[PDB]
C-alpha cells in the first residue's frame, strides 16, 4: 500500500516519512498513513519556516534579521513541537 508524492515523482509505504516542499520555499514533514486512499499527513512542527526570510530552518539553525527599528536580531530555531523560534537583540 503506497502513498505518492506526485511533485517529487516518488512513492512511500505506510509509516515512512519524508520531506516535501510547501508553497515554494517552506518545508513540511509528511508521513504515509495510506488508509486505502494514499493518505499522508504533513506538518512543519519540527521546522522553522520564517516568512520574513522565505527560508526553511532546522532545529538549532541560527539566522539574523532586522526588527522594525533597525536592530539586528539573532534567531534560533527551537521547534517546541510547534514550528517555534526565538530572536534576540
Amino acid at each position: 500500500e503506497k502513498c505518492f508524492d506526485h511533485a517529487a515523482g516518488t512513492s512511500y509505504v505506510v509509516g515512512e516519512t519524508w520531506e516535501k516542499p510547501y508553497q515554494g520555499w517552506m518545508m513540511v514533514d509528511c508521513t504515509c498513513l495510506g488508509e486505502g486512499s494514499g493518505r499522508i499527513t504533513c506538518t512543519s512542527r519540527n521546522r522553522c519556516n520564517d516568512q520574513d526570510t522565505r527560508t526553511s530552518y532546522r532545529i538549532g539553525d541560527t539566522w539574523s534579521k532586522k526588527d522594525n527599528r533597525g536592530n539586528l536580531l539573532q534567531c534560533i530555531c527551537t521547534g517546541n513541537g510547534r514550528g517555534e523560534w526565538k530572536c534576540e537583540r
Binding site: 505518492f4 486512499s37 506538518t43 512543519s44 534576540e88
Partner: peptide, 17 residues
Amino acid sequence: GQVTTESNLVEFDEEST
C-alpha cells in the same frame, strides 16, 4: 538581549493515487 518568539505551523492531510 530582548527576546521575540514566533512560530509558524503548517498542518494538512491529503490523499494520493
